[PDB]
Design a protein around this ligand. Structure first.
Ligand SMILES: [Mg+2]
Ligand SMILES: [Mg+2]
Ligand SMILES: [Mg+2]
Ligand SMILES: [Mg+2]
Ligand SMILES: [Mg+2]
Ligand SMILES: [Mg+2]
Ligand SMILES: [Mg+2]
Ligand code: NA
Lengths: 379, 381
């Protein structure tokens, strides 16, 4: 199942813990272009989910999602008291870790898969000089834009294709984050595209941070991430737009979504309205918007499945340099248990191929259609 | 830890000792007692014997029965359940389920889980006459307790102006659980003066337009909806109004946390399917969108405002009427057994001699979650 070599590296840093992992599928061997690696599908003490192991040194730790606060002022007071913290952009994208492994630059998704799309086009997004000088470091960033393989939308100021946004630089094996100041100096030196840095703030400037959130909401942007200078304390606060747009997109599918998906966003909206003491007409605008994004996409999908045999679907586009990359993506999508096929192809004026993928949602379609056709259930 | 006497009754019903023992081990069957009478309660279902079944002796087995399945699409729900055959349409009443039976020389009232309800048992003779059990000791009256002064619900049907009322919806045989045909049940309710759910009439798929009109009237009257039953009571489905769904959200949003899994999602789904079936669009649709957002956010934001000031917990106040003060204290004890945090907040005597008890239920887990979030606690999704 798993080589004794990988099990051995795991011993460094129970043999039955390894074995239960091996048996349950918590650790699995994988391979990319001949390079074999171990992927941690489940977290094992210090080693988080998404950790990948190629050898003793090439260990790329997974890292978790950033904790959210739903109440900005008290969230800051709890996390930072009155000490300063950096405020950076939260970007609506998917997480990647970029590392040099052997002579190759590989890009890993959150779960620890080598992403064939982002890996092939990595030199379009970043320069490789960084890894010549820092081969033991991992660039952690968001891939975001309107032509994404994993998200239907993204930041509004990315007008085409997709872009990388650095938000952390971590050491291999330890996972240690560089202090903010050092990471920002490295990004400037090596021309690594970065999340926007809004500045250094503290609890006393909460009014300025509320004003920033209001601007970001109007600009249809995701929100902010707050970081101690030493990167040891990090919390995220997202805009009302992020929560409402999330519901709008998810309501098309509705069923078979993550547990609490809509609840979590309703809660973040309520706490924003409570904290900011929004009332009257402004409050009514938000209530109207929440009702529309829960119901309109959902009802439109019901009309879709009521009038034919086609499945609920999402269309998305990406750009690739080689057609073979599109077929490698289809294979990778299938491994992720996603039902995606190539729906359309065009060649761009710059020589890139624009691939239109279509993802269908068979389980949500089936549950929706059964309910439309009168299936009866208890709550 | 279940007696051999009770275990044997189950065996006599064909149940296996390995199932019985596995049930004993998980807690699927537990012994309970009311006023000295010991019985077995099925907290989990055992093959033929559903959850909430209670066993006092060989004859006094009162089967539990599940919630009635809902359809979210009325026309296709009818076609699937009944095809074009006729079915009775009765009111769904927003209340709590009870089973009323004669056990020995006592009339006992059971809630859905198989607990004897101290409140409803004490006041049963206010709601129904006991003549029925003199003639039919082997039958179980199944109904809803509903009204503005309920121990378990904060609201109820708008035409019940005070106190609480019983609404018969089924008559079942002991041990077998067999439901009497609709026509037989209605004849018995008339003969014995048993208060009943409203029967709107006999309908079929071809009359779908009249049923949509009925739902429209019931929504404007702030009523729960309809229950559709084959004459033989073997096929039963329920369809609730937009009001039932919107009001459920409004009430629940005050608490928000620690509610049943999918509570709000289930109701958003029922509104969407109603809007789709009825092809509501434009301004009419916007009115429902405005209403859904208001009932999700306004009660929730109001509770956040509440917990942001002071140390008081999210609470609901409700009243009941009792004949004896001792019944109120038995209710507090019973509420605690159910893991509910309820105390007596106020008491008054009515001009007719009843005691009106005001209970206060507090929600400590929902309060704590909401307060921690207000105070900046950080979590992943
Ligand atoms: Mg897109
Ligand atoms: Mg988003
Ligand atoms: Mg999102
Ligand atoms: Mg009440
Ligand atoms: Mg209800
Ligand atoms: Mg209700
Ligand atoms: Mg208060
Ligand atoms: Na269609």
């Amino acid at each position: 199942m798993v080589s004794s070599y990988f099990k051995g590296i795991l011993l460094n840093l129970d043999e039955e813990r390894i074995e239960v992992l091996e048996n349950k599928g918590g650790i699995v061997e994988d391979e990319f272009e001949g390079m074999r690696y171990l992927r941690l599908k489940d977290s094992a003490r210090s080693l988080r989910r998404g950790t990948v192991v190629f050898d003793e040194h090439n260990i790329i730790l997974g890292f978790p999602h950033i904790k959210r606060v739903v109440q900005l002022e008290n969230g800051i007071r709890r996390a930072f008291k009155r000490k300063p913290f950096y405020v950076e952009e939260a970007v609506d994208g998917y997480n990647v870790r970029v590392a040099k492994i052997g002579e190759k630059i590989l890009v890993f998704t959150r779960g620890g898969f080598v992403c064939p799309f982002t890996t092939e086009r990595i030199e379009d997004f970043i320069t490789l000089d960084f890894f010549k000088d820092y081969p033991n470091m991992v660039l952690c960033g968001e891939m975001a834009g309107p032509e994404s393989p994993y998200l239907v939308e993204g930041p509004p100021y990315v007008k085409e294709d997709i872009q990388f946004f650095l938000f952390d630089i971590q050491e291999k094996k330890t996972g240690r984050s560089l202090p903010v100041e050092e990471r920002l100096k490295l990004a400037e030196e090596y021309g690594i595209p970065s999340v926007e840095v809004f500045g250094l703030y503290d609890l006393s400037r909460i009014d300025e941070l509320h004003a920033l959130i209001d601007r970001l909401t109007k600009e249809k942007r995701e929100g902010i991430v707050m970081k101690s200078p030493d990167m040891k304390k990090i919390v995220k606060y997202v805009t009302p737009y992020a929560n409402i747009n999330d519901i709008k997109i998810g309501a098309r599918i509705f069923f078979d979504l993550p547990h609490g998906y809509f609840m979590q966003r309703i809660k973040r909206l309520a706490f924003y309205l409570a904290e900011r003491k929004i009332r009257g007409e402004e409050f009514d605008e938000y209530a109207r918007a929440l009702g529309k994004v829960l119901l309109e996409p959902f009802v439109e999908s019901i009309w879709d499945i009521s009038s034919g045999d086609d499945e609920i679907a999402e269309l998305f586009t990406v750009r690739v340099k080689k057609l073979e990359t599109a077929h490698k993506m289809v294979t990778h999508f299938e491994r992720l248990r996603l039902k995606i096929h190539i729906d359309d192809i065009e060649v761009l004026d710059n020589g890139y191929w624009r691939i239109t993928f279509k993802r269908v949602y068979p389980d949500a379609t089936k549950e929706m259609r059964e309910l439309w056709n009168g299936h009866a259930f208890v709550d």
